[PDB]
Amino acid sequence: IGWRREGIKYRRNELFLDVLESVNLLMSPQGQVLSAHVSGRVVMKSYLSGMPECKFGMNDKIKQSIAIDDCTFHQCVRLSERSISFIPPDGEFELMRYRTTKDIILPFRVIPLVREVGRTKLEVKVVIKSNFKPSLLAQKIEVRIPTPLNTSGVQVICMKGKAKYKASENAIVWKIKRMAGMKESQISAEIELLPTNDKKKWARPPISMNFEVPFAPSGLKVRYLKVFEPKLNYSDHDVIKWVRYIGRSGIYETRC
Amino acid sequence: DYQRLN
């Protein structure tokens, strides 16, 4: 084996699995998902004695059951339910990489409301709703609301988090440290507008979000990670196993 | 965060 030496030993046989996923979305003003997909990778961190023969099993029939459009593996994976079999490198390594498009959990719903006031003001209300287990917290949430070029100033009211008008970037950035699943939040903003060439209207860019959630938006779940070492005297249940899910936004836009 | 696998 060119990726793993042979005399490795550890008193504490332990492994760490990381399900990293980027969830991307393009949503219309009328709530239709124009486009959506997830890109994930499973990173394994393992400190196992010998030359262990592991079995990675996830919810792949295609309750809990998800479809994988495509995917790639680490050379150690022996290709041919039918699950992943390998003798992993020691330390950290990327076990697999995959994409998903079907039955994707969109962690956040963005509901925008814009109202024009003559030519001097824009009235914006943006509501964000978290679509996930209430015991789970989203972290690092950011809502980005674009403002027109002719913005002379911005007033915002937000009961949760902090928001800043960014002239330079032409946008209102609302930041929230954490937010529990199944919740609602809103931001109100009054955009003060300068005179402008009447003829050219404003092409309103989408409202975009940044967030990090503790579950895989694709719905993927680790079932088991079976360790077998025929020579050495530790069995699968001697192994200490941990899994973590870090789902993060990729492109996540809401057309207003 | 990390959770014990089954």
Side-chain angles (χ1 to χ4, degrees), chain A residues 21-62 64-81 83-101 103-118 120-161 163-177 179-189:
Chain A
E21 294 186 349
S22 133
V23 46
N24 304 266
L25 180 60
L26 213 214
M27 184 99 75
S28 71
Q30 302 78 233
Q32 297 321 294
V33 163
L34 289 186
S35 187
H37 82 260
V38 163
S39 295
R41 56 187 301 231
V42 181
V43 171
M44 177 172 186
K45 278 176 297 182
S46 54
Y47 318 82
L48 312 162
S49 279
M51 298 305 287
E53 287 193 84
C54 326
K55 280 158 203 287
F56 186 53
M58 55 187 160
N59 51 0
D60 198 15
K61 309 180 164 199
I62 285 187
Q64 320 169 344
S65 74
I66 61 151
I68 292 197
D69 310 331
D70 77 284
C71 61
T72 39
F73 299 91
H74 185 264
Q75 77 193 1
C76 77
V77 176
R78 300 308 156 204
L79 289 318
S80 310
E81 322 167 17
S83 278
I84 303 90
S85 279
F86 57 99
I87 288 177
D90 176 75
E92 175 266 326
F93 84 98
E94 186 185 284
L95 173 60
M96 60 179 304
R97 197 165 261 261
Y98 58 93
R99 182 195 190 72
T100 271
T101 42
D103 310 312
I104 292 169
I105 301 156
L106 298 183
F108 284 96
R109 183 80 171 71
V110 184
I111 298 112
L113 204 68
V114 178
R115 211 181 87 213
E116 296 174 17
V117 170
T120 293
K121 287 146 180 294
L122 281 177
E123 289 309 318
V124 172
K125 177 174 76 177
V126 173
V127 172
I128 46 151
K129 273 159 206 306
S130 39
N131 179 28
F132 48 87
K133 273 199 259 148
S135 34
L136 299 179
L137 278 189
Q139 79 189 4
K140 281 158 287 182
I141 311 140
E142 195 212 271
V143 188
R144 155 142 207 141
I145 307 149
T147 48
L149 318 64
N150 50 311
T151 300
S152 57
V154 170
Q155 295 310 303
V156 306
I157 280 188
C158 77
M159 296 297 303
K160 269 113 174 253
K164 291 154 197 49
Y165 172 51
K166 290 205 101 185
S168 34
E169 299 165 40
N170 286 317
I172 291 149
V173 173
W174 169 31
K175 290 191 185 161
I176 300 148
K177 315 223 200 68
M179 170 180 296
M182 304 318 315
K183 288 264 175 192
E184 279 193 29
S185 281
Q186 68 190 236
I187 182 154
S188 278

Side-chain angles (χ1 to χ4, degrees), chain A residues 18 45 223 241-243, chain B:
Chain A
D18 293 351
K45 278 176 297 182
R223 305 298 178 173
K241 301 157 188 181
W242 312 83
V243 173
Chain B
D1 296 5
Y2 277 120
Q3 285 323 328
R4 287 303 299 266
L5 166 61
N6 285 2

